[PDB]
């Protein structure tokens, strides 16, 4: 597969819930930061269509609880509810969260093991050789562009093996998927987004098509809207690369990111290998930075601005 155009990653860290019932839409709208992804009204010849969107579930304090990708699938000129793609490790907690609010509402929430979550990323950055993909929508497979950024390729929800639907697709090593996210500054899951600690706008939610300022009320809206409108977001998650060999255990989440003069300009969040994310003061990412290790020499790191941010 030296000539593969696409790498297909089985995302064991992500899982699906199906939310259905007559009140599913208003119910989810009150809990999420975004509009729901509803396919456009269907034409006579009714070829199935799916829509994806990004959102967070926030707490009443305005902090991120869960990052989710939302999928709406249209088949008989109607939508049969939504799929919620969440971190596997919080699937139980997210069910309990939905149950707390689902009191007396016509809504069903169930695990959807029928589809497994895959990502499909280009083998080449901007190669544009060939093998543009086409959206697919059916109960057995949905292939749809990542709603956060085109830098994240395609999501594939399927019963079967990834490459069997993607021309020029090969199986990918999960390490490379996470490497890609950290190089591109894309947070995903509970290590990047600690529930009740990560703040949505500092997590670049508005750069990732994940928040609406026109939608009706939702949990955590008041603080989110206030933060958005009161000025520039002072701290954000940025991609970082370590420039010095790391310690055996790596960098501890929360490790302070310092200037040459020892000023705190943020904290390491999470990563893999020599790359990761750090929550940094946006005006201070420029001068050489470091983290203190056991011996106060290393560890140098460089922060950068993702090319897909606005």
CA-only gyration radius of the chain, Å: 20
Ramachandran angles phi, psi of 291, nearest 5°: -115, 145
Resolution in A: 1.5
User: Coil, strand or helix: which one is 278?
Assistant: strand
Helices and strands in the chain: count of H runs, count of E runs = 4, 17
Q: Would you kindly state where each structural domain of the chain is located, as residue ranges?
A: 1-310
Beta bridge partners of 302: 241
Q: How far apart are CA 60 and CA 267, in angstroms?
A: 24
> Cβ distance 68 to 57 under 8 Å?
yes
Q: How far apart are CA 212 and CA 221, in angstroms?
A: 9
CB–CB of 26/35 below 8 Å? no
Helix (H, G, I), strand (E, B) or coil at 284: helix
Calculated CA dihedral for residues 222, 225, 229, 230, nearest 10 degrees: 40
CA distances from residue 18 to 26, 113, 273, 299 in whole angstroms, order as listed? 15, 10, 34, 44
CA distance 122 to 58: 32
Phi, psi of 223 (to 5 degrees): -65, -40
Q: Where are the beta strands (DSSP E) in 59-107?
A: 64-74, 79-87
| Cβ proximity of 235 and 266 under 8 Å | yes
Location of structure tokens 């034409």: 43
Q: How far apart are CA 124 and CA 116, in angstroms?
A: 25
Alpha-helix residue ranges (DSSP H) falling in the chain: 24-29, 91-101, 174-184, 221-230
Question: d(Cα 291, Cα 293) in Å, to the nearest integer?
Answer: 6
Cα 115 to Cα 67: distance, rounded to the nearest angstrom: 19
Q: Which residues of 269-282 are buried (b: 16+ CB within 10 A; e: fewer)?
A: bbbeebbbbbbbeb
Residue 236 φ then ψ, to 5°: -145, 160
CA distance readout (Å), 151 to 115, 181, 183: 23, 9, 10
């Amino acid at each position: 597969t030296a000539g593969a155009a696409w790498a297909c990653f089985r995302l064991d860290g992500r899982t699906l819930l199906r939310v259905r019932g007559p009140d599913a839409a208003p119910f989810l709208l009150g809990l999420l930061t975004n509009e729901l992804p509803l396919p456009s009204p269907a034409a006579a010849g009714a070829p199935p269509a799916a829509r994806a969107g990004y959102a967070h579930f926030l707490n009443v304090q305005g902090r991120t609880l869960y990052d989710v990708i939302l999928y709406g699938l249209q088949e008989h000129s109607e939508v049969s509810g939504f799929l919620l793609e969440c971190d596997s490790s919080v699937q139980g907690a997210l069910q309990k969260h939905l149950a707390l609010y689902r009191i007396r509402r016509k809504v069903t929430v169930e695990p959807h093991p029928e589809l497994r979550v895959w990502a499909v990323l280009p083998s080449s950055p901007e190669a544009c050789g060939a093998a543009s993909l086409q959206e697919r929508a059916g109960a057995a497979a949905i292939l749809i562009r990542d709603p956060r950024t085109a830098r994240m390729g395609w999501r594939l929800l399927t019963q079967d093996e990834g490459p069997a639907l993607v021309p020029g697709g090969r199986l990918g090593d999960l390490w490379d998927y996470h490497q890609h996210r950290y190089l591109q500054g894309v947070p995903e899951g509970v290590r990047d987004l600690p529930p009740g600690v990560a703040l949505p706008l500092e997590s670049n939610l508005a750069f990732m098509n994940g928040v609406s300022f026109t939608k009706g009320a939702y949990i955590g809206q008041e603080l989110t809207a206030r933060t958005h409108h009161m000025g520039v977001i002072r701290k954000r998650l940025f991609p970082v690369r370590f420039l010095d060999p790391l310690p055996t255990s790596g960098i501890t989440p929360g490790a302070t990111v310092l200037t040459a003069s020892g000023q705190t300009v943020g904290k390491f969040r999470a990563g893999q290998g020599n790359v990761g994310l750090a929550l940094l003061w946006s005006e201070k990412i420029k001068g050489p930075l470091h983290i203190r290790a056991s011996e106060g020499a290393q560890v140098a790191l460089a922060a950068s601005v993702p090319d897909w941010w606005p």
